[PDB]
Tab-separated table of C-alpha atoms in Angstrom:
chain	number	residue	atom	x	y	z
A	1	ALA	CA	98.657	107.757	113.016
A	2	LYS	CA	97.644	104.100	112.756
A	3	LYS	CA	94.928	104.807	110.187
A	4	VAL	CA	96.841	103.719	107.087
A	5	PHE	CA	94.085	101.119	107.188
A	6	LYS	CA	92.308	103.444	104.791
A	7	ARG	CA	94.911	102.854	102.095
A	8	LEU	CA	94.756	99.142	102.846
A	9	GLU	CA	90.967	99.280	102.774
A	10	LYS	CA	91.329	100.916	99.362
A	11	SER	CA	93.255	97.935	98.002
A	12	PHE	CA	90.779	95.474	99.514
A	13	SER	CA	87.809	97.666	98.577
A	14	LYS	CA	88.224	96.511	94.976
A	15	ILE	CA	87.662	92.926	96.117
A	16	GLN	CA	84.425	93.919	97.850
A	17	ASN	CA	83.027	94.955	94.468
A	18	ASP	CA	84.012	91.719	92.726
A	19	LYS	CA	82.707	89.547	95.564
């Protein structure tokens, strides 16, 4: 149930590309 991290990782994932 505490895996919303995925959605959060999705928002931060964009930053990983523009590092």
